[PDB]
Amino acid sequence: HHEPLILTAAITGAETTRADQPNLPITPEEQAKEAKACFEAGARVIHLHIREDDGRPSQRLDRFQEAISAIREVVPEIIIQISTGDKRLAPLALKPEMATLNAGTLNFGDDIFINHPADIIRLAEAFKQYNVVPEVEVYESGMVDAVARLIKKGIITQNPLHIQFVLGVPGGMSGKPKNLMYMMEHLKEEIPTATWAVAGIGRWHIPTSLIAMVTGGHIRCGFEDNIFYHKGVIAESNAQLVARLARIAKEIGRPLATPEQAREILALN
Amino acid sequence: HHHHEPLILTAAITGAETTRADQPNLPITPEEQAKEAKACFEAGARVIHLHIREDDGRPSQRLDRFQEAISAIREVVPEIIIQISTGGAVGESFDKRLAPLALKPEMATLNAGTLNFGDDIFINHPADIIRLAEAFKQYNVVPEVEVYESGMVDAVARLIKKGIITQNPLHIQFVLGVPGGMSGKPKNLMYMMEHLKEEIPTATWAVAGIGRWHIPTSLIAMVTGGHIRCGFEDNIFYHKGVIAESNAQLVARLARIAKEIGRPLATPEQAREILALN
Amino acid sequence: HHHEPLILTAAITGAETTRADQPNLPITPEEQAKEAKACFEAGARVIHLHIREDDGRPSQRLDRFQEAISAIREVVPEIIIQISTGGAVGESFDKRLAPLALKPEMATLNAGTLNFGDDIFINHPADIIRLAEAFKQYNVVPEVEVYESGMVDAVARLIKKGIITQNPLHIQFVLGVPGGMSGKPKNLMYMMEHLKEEIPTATWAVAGIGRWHIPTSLIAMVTGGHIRCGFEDNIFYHKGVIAESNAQLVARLARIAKEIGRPLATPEQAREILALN
Amino acid sequence: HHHEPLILTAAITGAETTRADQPNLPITPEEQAKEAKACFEAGARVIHLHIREDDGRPSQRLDRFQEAISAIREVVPEIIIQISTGDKRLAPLALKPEMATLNAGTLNFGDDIFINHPADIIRLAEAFKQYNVVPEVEVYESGMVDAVARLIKKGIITQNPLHIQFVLGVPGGMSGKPKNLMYMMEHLKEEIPTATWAVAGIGRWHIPTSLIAMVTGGHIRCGFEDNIFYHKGVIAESNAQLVARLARIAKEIGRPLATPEQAREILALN
Ligand SMILES: [Zn+2]
Ligand SMILES: [Zn+2]
Ligand SMILES: [Zn+2]
Ligand SMILES: [Zn+2]
Judge whether A210 is closer than 8 Å to chain C, CB to CB: yes
For chain B, state the CA radius of gyration.
17
Q: Which ligand is nearest to the CA of A49?
A: 1
* C101 and chain A in contact, CB less than 8 A: no
- Flag whether residue C193 sits within 8 Å of chain A, measured between CB atoms: yes
Is D142 flagged in the annotation as binding? no
CB C45, CB C7: distance < 8 Å: yes
Start-end of H helices in D24-163: 29-42, 62-75, 118-130, 142-153
Cα gap D105→D185, rounded to integer Å = 18
Residues from chain C contacting residue A215 (CB–CB below 8 Å): 185, 215
3-state secondary structure of C198: helix
The distance of A167 to chain B (nearest Cα, Å) reads 9
CA distance C154 to chain D (A): 6
Per-residue DSSP letter, B5: S
- Consecutive H or E run containing C189: helix C185-198
Whether chain B has a CB inside 8 Å of the CB on A119: the answer is no
**Pairing between β-strand C44-49 and β-strand C80-83 as defined by DSSP bridges:** parallel
Q: Residue A86: which residues within 8 A CB-CB, separation 6 or more? A: A122
Contacts of A181 in chain C (CB under 8 A): 185-186, 189
DSSP 8-state class, residue A173 = -
CA C72 to chain centre: 17
| Residue B261 in contact with partner chain D when CB distance is under 8 A | yes
Which residues is A164 bridged to in the sheet? A137, A197
DSSP for residue A86: -
Resolution (A): 1.6
Q: CA B225, B228, B231 angle in degrees (round to 5)?
A: 170
Nearest to A105 among B116, B158, B178 (CB): B116
Nearest to B260 among D2, D216, D245 (CB): D245
Beta carbons of C172 and C207 less than 8 angstroms apart: yes
Chains that touch A (3 or more CB pairs under 8 A): B, C
Residue B82 and residue B72: Cα distance in Å, rounded? Answer: 11
Residues of chain A with C-beta less than 8 angstroms from the C-beta of C260? 206, 210, 248
Residue from the list B1, B239, B262 with its beta carbon closest to the beta carbon of D232:
B262
* Of the candidates D141, D92, D95, D93, the residue with the CA atom closest to the CA atom of residue D116: D141
CA–CA min distance A29, chain C (Å): 30
Residue B123, chain D, CB below 8 Å: the answer is no
The DSSP secondary-structure symbol of B266 reads: P
Amino acid identity of D160? N
CB A166 within 8 A of CB A139: yes
- Cα–Cα distance for residue pair B101/B94, rounded to 1 Å: 13
- Whether residue B120 lies within 8 A of chain A, CB to CB, comes out as yes
Compute the distance between CA of residue A113 and CA of residue C269 in angstroms, rounded to an integer.
Answer: 44
Among A108, A55, A44, smallest CA distance to A242 is for: A44
- Residue A83 assigned ligand-binding role: yes
Q: Say what the alpha-carbon torsion angle C179, C185, C186, C192 is, to the nearest 10 degrees.
A: 90
Per DSSP, chain D holds a count of helices (H) and strands (E) of 8, 14
> In whole angstroms, how far apart are CA B51 and each of B18, B28, B133, B231?
11, 9, 19, 12
CB within 8 Å: B257 and D245: no
Distance CA A138, CA A153 (A): 19
> Helical H runs in B44-185?
63-76, 95-98, 126-138, 150-161
Cα distance between residue A230 and residue A265, in whole Å: 31
CA distance B49 to B40: 11
Collect residues with CB below 5 Å from ion ligand 4.
Answer: D 84
Dmax over CA atoms of chain A, in Å, equals 47
What angle (nearest 5°) sits at the alpha carbon of residue D93, between those of residues D90 and D95?
Answer: 135
Question: Across the interface, which of C214, C222, C238 has its CB nearest the CB of A206?
Answer: C222
Confirm if A233 and A223 have CB atoms less than 8 A apart.
Answer: no
Residue B156: C-alpha distances to residues A62, A172, B148, C36, D232 (Å)? 43, 12, 12, 49, 38
Which of D177, D179, D211 shows the shortest C-beta gap to B261?
D211
Task: For each of the domains in chain D, give its residue range(s) and CATH number, in order of start.
Answer: 1-270 (3.20.20.70)
**Closest ligand (CA of B51):** 2
Task: Tell me if D208 and B4 make a contact (CB, 8 A cut-off).
Answer: no
Give first-to-last CA distance, chain A, whole Å.
25
Q: Can you say whether residue A64 is alpha, beta or left, with left for phi > 0 and alpha for psi between -120 and 50 degrees? A: alpha
Distance CA B249, CA B227 (A): 18
Beta strands (DSSP E) in A202-262 are 218-221, 228-230, 233-234
To the nearest whole Å, the CA of A175 is away from the closest chain C CA by 11
Q: Which of C23, C103, A142 is nearest to B148 (CA)?
A: A142
- Going from the Cα of C14 to the center of ligand 3, the distance in angstroms, rounded, reads 5
* Phi/psi of residue C174, nearest 5 degrees: -120, 105
CB contact under 8 A, C150 and D141: yes
Q: d(Cα A126, Cα A120) in Å, to the nearest integer?
A: 10
3-state secondary structure of C168: coil
Residue B195 to chain A, least CA–CA distance (Å) = 8
Strand partners of residue B267: none
Minimal C-alpha gap between D116 and chain C (Å): 8
- C186 neighbourhood in chain A, CB within 8 Å: 181, 185
Return the beta strands (E) in chain B as ranges: 9-12, 45-50, 81-84, 107-111, 115-117, 120-122, 142-147, 171-176, 204-209, 227-230, 237-239, 242-243
B206 closest CA partner among B235, B175, B185 = B175
> What does residue D96 show for φ and ψ, rounded to 5 degrees?
55, 55
Residue B68 CA: distances (Å) to CA of B65, B144, C134, D72: 5, 22, 72, 65
Query: C222 at the A interface (CB within 8 A)?
Result: yes
Amino acid identity of residue B183, one-letter, is S
- Nearest C-alpha neighbor of C78 from the set C48, C138, C36: C36
- Check CB contact under 8 Å for A1 and C215: yes
The vertex-A254 CA angle with A250 and A259, nearest 5°, equals 95
A10 CB-contact burial (10 Å; exposed 0-12 / middle 13-18 / buried 19+):
buried
The torsion angles phi and psi of D45, rounded to 5 degrees, stand at: -115, -10
| CB contact (8 A) between residue C115 and residue D108 | no
- Cα of D260 to ligand 4 centre, how many Å? 21
> Nearest Cβ partner of D212 from B215, B223, B239?
B223
Neighbours of chain B (3+ CB pairs under 8 A): A, D
Q: Which residues pair with B45 in a beta bridge?
A: B9
**Is D105 in contact with C114 (Cβ distance < 8 A)?**
yes
CB-side exposure of D125: number of CA atoms within 13 Å?
24
Determine the residue type at C238.
Answer: H
Beta bridge partners of D138: D103, D165
Q: Are the Cβ atoms of B115 and A106 closer than 8 angstroms? A: yes
Answer whether C43's CB lies under 8 Å from C5's CB.
no
Known binding-site residues of C for (5S)-5-amino-3-oxohexanoate equal: 16, 84, 87, 108, 110
**Phi/psi at A166 (nearest 5 deg)?**
-120, 105
d(CA C222, CA C3): 8
Q: Give the integer Cα–Cα distance in Å for C268 and C276.
A: 10
Distance from CA of D179 to the nearest CA of C (A): 8
